[PDB]
Amino acid sequence: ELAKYGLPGVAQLRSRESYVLSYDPRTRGALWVLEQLRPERLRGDGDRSACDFREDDSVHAYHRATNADYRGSGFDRGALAAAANHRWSQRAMDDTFYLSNVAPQVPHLNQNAWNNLERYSRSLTRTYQNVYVCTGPLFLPRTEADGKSYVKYQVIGKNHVAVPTHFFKVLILEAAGGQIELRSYVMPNAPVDETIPLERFLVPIESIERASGLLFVP
Amino acid sequence: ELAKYGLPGVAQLRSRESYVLSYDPRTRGALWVLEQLRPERLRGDGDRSACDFREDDSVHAYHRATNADYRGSGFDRGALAAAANHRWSQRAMDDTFYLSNVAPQVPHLNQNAWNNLERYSRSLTRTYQNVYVCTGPLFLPRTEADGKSYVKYQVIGKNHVAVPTHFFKVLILEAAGGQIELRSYVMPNAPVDETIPLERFLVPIESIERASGLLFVP
Numbered sequence: 001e002l003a004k005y006g007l008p009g010v011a012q013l014r015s016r017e018s019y020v021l022s023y024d025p026r027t028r029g030a031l032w033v034l035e036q037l038r039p040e041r042l043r044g045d046g047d048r049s050a051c052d053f054r055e056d057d058s059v060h061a062y063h064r065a066t067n068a069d070y071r072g073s074g075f076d077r078g079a080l081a082a083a084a085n086h087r088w089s090q091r092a093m094d095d096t097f098y099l100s101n102v103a104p105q106v107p108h109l110n111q112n113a114w115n116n117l118e119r120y121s122r123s124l125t126r127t128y129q130n131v132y133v134c135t136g137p138l139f140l141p142r143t144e145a146d147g148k149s150y151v152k153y154q155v156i157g158k159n160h161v162a163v164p165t166h167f168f169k170v171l172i173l174e175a176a177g178g179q180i181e182l183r184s185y186v187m188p189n190a191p192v193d194e195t196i197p198l199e200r201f202l203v204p205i206e207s208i209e210r211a212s213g214l215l216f217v218p
Numbered sequence: 219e220l221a222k223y224g225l226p227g228v229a230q231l232r233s234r235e236s237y238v239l240s241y242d243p244r245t246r247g248a249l250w251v252l253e254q255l256r257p258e259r260l261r262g263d264g265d266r267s268a269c270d271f272r273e274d275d276s277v278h279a280y281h282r283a284t285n286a287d288y289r290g291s292g293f294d295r296g297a298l299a300a301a302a303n304h305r306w307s308q309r310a311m312d313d314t315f316y317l318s319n320v321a322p323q324v325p326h327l328n329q330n331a332w333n334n335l336e337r338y339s340r341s342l343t344r345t346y347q348n349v350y351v352c353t354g355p356l357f358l359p360r361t362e363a364d365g366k367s368y369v370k371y372q373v374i375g376k377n378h379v380a381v382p383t384h385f386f387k388v389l390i391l392e393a394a395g396g397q398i399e400l401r402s403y404v405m406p407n408a409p410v411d412e413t414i415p416l417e418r419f420l421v422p423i424e425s426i427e428r429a430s431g432l433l434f435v436p
């Protein structure tokens with residue numbers, strides 16, 4: 001048999017209380033995380049200190065981000081499935097502090113501009129019955145003086161956790177009616193101004209689908 | 219439950235007559251390719267023109283490598299599963315010319331030193347009843363002027379096909395008496411001296427396992 005000893009590659013799905021993620025052991029962070037925020041269900045009892053992030057013991061130690069990797073890095077532990085999205089229940093929001101839900105994020109971006117869009121998705125849960133949000137990183141290519149195009153991203157910690165160049169957020173908004181409503185955003189991993197209107201970052205989703213390796217048109 | 223709209227990330231395993239691969243839609247290349255070389259049966263009468271490659275149709279057109287991506291790159295279409303490994307059957311060799319089995323490779327490496335390593339793998343079908351080979355790319359970080367580590371690789375064509383910085387090859391040498399011995403090689407995607415003994419590119423498998431995100435030890 002060709003599979004006599006096992007295949008080296010894992011399809012690394014995780015389904016937590018609060019989201020589903022697909023994990024990439026090479027980047028030491030998630031490919032995508034999808035949550036369904038419904039209203040009804042956002043605001044609730046439960047909280048946790050802003051810094052109580054935990055490594056994921058379901059990920060092999062070879063490919064597992066640790067708090068030490070972020071230590072001294074200048075990057076926030078930016079959660080993709082946001083914490084205030086799941087104040088519904090306690091470990092429903094404890095699952096959002098696993099480092100599998102986290103990518104190195106420029107702190108000004110984590111606290112102001114990505115934060116405003118997190119609010120926007122939390123505001124749009126108001127016009128539509130159900131709001132599904134899928135979030136993840138981008139590593140976008142970039143030319144230099146020689147004319148050739150390069151992907152270049154920073155790598156932090158001894159475990160070499162990748163710092164994304166960009167992040168995407170795609171929302172498909174509905175149950176209560178007829179169900180069109182797809183909206184796609186991308187911001188660079190950089191101190192982007194809070195003043196810029198949120199929709200200056202709208203992008204067609206195949207932009208994201210080609211770059212990310214994922215397919216969203218279902 | 220939130221999976222009501224499927225998942226955007228499909229794990230990608232193809233099984234051809236000659237190998238199992240696992241595909242990466244973001245790099246537009248295989249994460250690994252798994253062959254089982256057996257002492258002679260896989261050297262028969264098959265043959266194929268050396269540049270006759272097919273773009274894979276089992277991969278969505280947003281994430282697939284094409285021959286136009288390679289055309290002006292300066293890079294060889296280096297087959298990870300070697301074509302000479304499967305003279306056994308015409309289809310077993312035609313499978314190795316799928317572009318999903320191919321990564322951008324510096325042509326001097328493809329034809330002198332990587333070639334010697336594959337000729338070395340085919341050789342060791344002397345001593346061992348079975349020789350398993352797993353080949354794949356590596357994207358290794360390098361340290362820059364500012365003291366930070368970055369992963370930097372070129373992308374070619376307008377599907378942005380990742381140019382690996384290194385290549386790994388793992389030999390699982392099954393001796394006739396059941397005994398299995400392990401061997402691991404990493405060579406840079408560069409013109410490297412074919413006169414250097416292949417012994418100098420030996421590396422520990424945990425090193426490939428931490429860099430690639432794969433787990434090999436059976």
Ligand SMILES: [Mg+2]
Pocket residue numbers: 077078079110
């Ligand atoms: Mg945050």
Ligand SMILES: [Mg+2]
Pocket residue numbers: 295296297328332
């Ligand atoms: Mg070759």
